[model samples]
Target: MATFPELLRPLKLGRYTLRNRIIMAPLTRCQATEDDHVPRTESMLKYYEDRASAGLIIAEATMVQPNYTGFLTEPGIYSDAQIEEWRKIVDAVHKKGGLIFLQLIHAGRAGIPEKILQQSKSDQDPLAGRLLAASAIPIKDHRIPAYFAASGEKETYGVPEELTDDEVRDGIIPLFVEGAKNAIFKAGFDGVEIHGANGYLLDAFFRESSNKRQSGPYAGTTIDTRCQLIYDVTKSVCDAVGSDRVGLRISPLNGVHGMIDSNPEALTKHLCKKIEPLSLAYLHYLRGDMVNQQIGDVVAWVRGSYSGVKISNLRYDFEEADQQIREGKVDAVAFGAKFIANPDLVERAQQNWPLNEPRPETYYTRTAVGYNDYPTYNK
Candidate 1:
């Protein structure tokens, strides 16, 4: 069997040279300041700097604009002040010799309306607001009960507004472009990773099961329109910061937050074929058997089609990842829960040390208790 050290060898991603093949997958810990704007606290920087030993670190999903704010206390890269604060974090990581990238994200319909409404300064912005969605279909099964904001304050899920064709063609595209520019020109990140994975806005457009439009440019245009949004967003970011410095992520069969892709194999194959010409820095593919039966085949297809770096993620241990890498199935591996708890995950796996357990309660908490307090391997 190939050892963990063998998997720890350096690999070049675009212009940046990584120290190893382990990537810290973008995990949303919600450890930002009270304003929900910047990551100003000391613990936030410590969380990432401690894990700087990883080959490459992708920061948590950060909002690109004020309207993009989805969660409470998540970081944003939309302003000069935000950029300055991130510069400090980036400098600290670089000082430790870590290559870091910012994951640019915009949450459309996944956020709660009550939360946004409460944050709004004026009554003109109604108490109830809808997030953007490809169609008017409301998210089912995962709905939290509705409650009053005062005496019975219970968080209510936001009903998303179906975006018009013009809005998508104009508003969304520009926002993505501006966000990419900010990530490159202001944040000083090595690159920016478009968060097309999970059930975010971009992913909503990509999946057929969630996007049920029947008219307009994106409506009923087949899977091509969905794929085009991903391509266009990637192109915008590439145009802003060069293709070499841009990366994209896709969860082919991930069904989180009521997201489902009826035909996973065909969808990914079409996407890979279209993306092959862009020559992106890397394509982070999430593979999970729970929703995808063709995980192995999809991996093989992406490897054969795309010539750039191909990183595999989702529920992988050291042994499995090492085997896959040795067999040349993938270039690198990304971890989520494991990397969150075991900040020194690569080292622990290298020496076969035990990993720290992740506390689910604190995953999205506003506090920093479990965010940066994870013990190191020696601890």
Candidate 2:
């Protein structure tokens, strides 16, 4: 367990020192109450509770506010029923002496709006009209993810309703703050992570290419203005739930999910510089196989700008992750897909045991066939 003890130490983060430095990153699984957008405790209690002893678990990306969604069962933090259900999950984790953070997200143009009546058919179906976004840009194509009995398929999305000036400054930003409060006061999380990545609402505004908002104070012109909403969101959330209890995730070179930054290096560096002052609990950085030429510059900037703990995620194995942590390159490592399949991921890491392969076919099912049957090492 040469690599295990070093990664398994109690490290300070905000008010809590997690049991280890291996966090479970947020992974969206359509495992929630149908129609109501609540976590299904019947199946969830064991699902989350089984992996509760992680260093830190940033639960799935939950919608801060939504009316209609392709991923219908994806949970939300807006309502009482939703809060109550999340509370149960939080309690379950706490009972096992674990700390969890709820991630707040908005799908932006990639999703259908609530004002639009419910319909899952393709864009030919008018009822599934244009969705809300940072600007009026249509992604051209989007995924209507499958859950339960539905089959996942690729489809086209039309130009969206550009968020009005008032909406950005007043409506959308506040909803993020409100979501943070709900996570703390109602949903029972130790903290919350602003989902400022993956071409979501907040990240859309940060990039020059994906979003081109030409007018208003929250315009997407310069880097400062481009990141205004994210800055505002980070401030509001931290003010609502202390700066130390908050975290932010970013993927500067992430080309997946219709995200593209014209000047990846410039955008990535500026974003981190602007966010550095807050002294967040951690800065979660999602990495991929390929990157922009200036990815080097981005790393150099992060080293100087962010002084607090850093979490590097994606394409990381046990040894690579531990070495980075031991070398002080990153404070923690977040595992998503691997953690999904191995309920005892931390245990296995510490023991250098074999791992179980995740069944991609059952990844989105409502049934627990693949969710619960995976086992821990016998030792």
Candidate 3:
């Protein structure tokens, strides 16, 4: 019998058919040029090229607006030079017969003010340096992790200025639309994954703790109101670049950065039902919290609610992933840390070979130590 018949099965995703069900989850590696947020060609090129065997590669969380970085060295898609570098990376992946998608993001309240202020000082743009979110709430009592800090100092998150309805419609949404446009038309990515997870911009509006808007289109009073921003952005991006090529990642139960929803089940069901009309290529759902503070059958919720392709993530192993696919729990599975160590993960899984353990230390280091140095099984 073919090894992992279900997981190794070819599946149709949006405009293209994937060779296997193994996807490379988007993991942020701060390897870009710090100043301009441009991707380093040599390092990034090789990093992605090495993992081109993935069924689909969701490139890391990328900035949609200039000078609004959450991770200091993470790449951006808002500039010409950035687009050029991304095109090269996408081309290299394509050359190796891989499909790639760029995850467009705006950090919202998660952005470090120090980094934004420092970069905005040089840009001279009116709307450049400010940290904005759904509400003015700050992630209380939490310090920015040292690895993700721009200055390598553990800084507290700044209180974000609440985005007015006009700002949401005109200022914030345009960045995502334009970013999607650039990624698809200019950078030549096969698609774009809207980063609606991990307590970032959209997630801030998603959960009740951060968004307390009393009124207006994006009021956080009801599930529909809070979901407006995500739905609008997804629809706009899908309109810009066909729905088949667009995907969204959501973590309703994920409590990282103090994110939580009073009724996660209701919120998730409503959001799924709300956006089902979009016919998105897939919905990448983070099944549970990283810290395990909150737990639920979130994967089951998505599988039960969403009618489209569902790719569930968080701490999935080869056997569990294959079993989930076989049981029809999820259409596909995304492995972040596993793919980080095993570049040829599909082959290793196919041959039932032992996998490499990922080194968490050098995950965000600016060097190639743990980035592309992981050797294939046969090597």
CA lDDT of every candidate? 0.77, 0.77, 0.91
In candidate 3, residue 188 scores what lDDT? 98
Identify the candidate with maximal TM-score: 3
Clash count for candidate 2 is: 1
Instruction: State the lDDT of candidate 2 residue by residue for 1-379, as single tens digits.
Output: 6656667877899888998887999977778876778888777778888898799999888877644353656788888888998999899989998899998897776674432334354644322334777888866444544352233444455467788877676777778889899999887899999988877778888877677888776677787788788888888899888998899988776765567777766766777778888888888877652333223344445665678878888767888777777777778889988888898998888888888988877777667887777788773
Best first by TM-score, ranked: 3, 2, 1
- Deviation of model 3 at 84, angstroms: 0.3
Which digits, one per residue and each the tens of the lDDT, describe model 1 over residues 67-165? 445665678887777778888888888899998889988776776565555564545532123477777666666543222121224454566778887
Q: Which candidate is the best by lDDT?
A: 3
lDDT of 3 by residue, 103-180 (tens): 999999989888886654434464577888999998887888898786697888898888889888988899999999
Could you give the C-alpha RMSD of every candidate to the true structure, in order shown?
3.5, 4.0, 1.4
Count of residue pairs whose backbone atoms collide, per candidate: 0, 1, 0
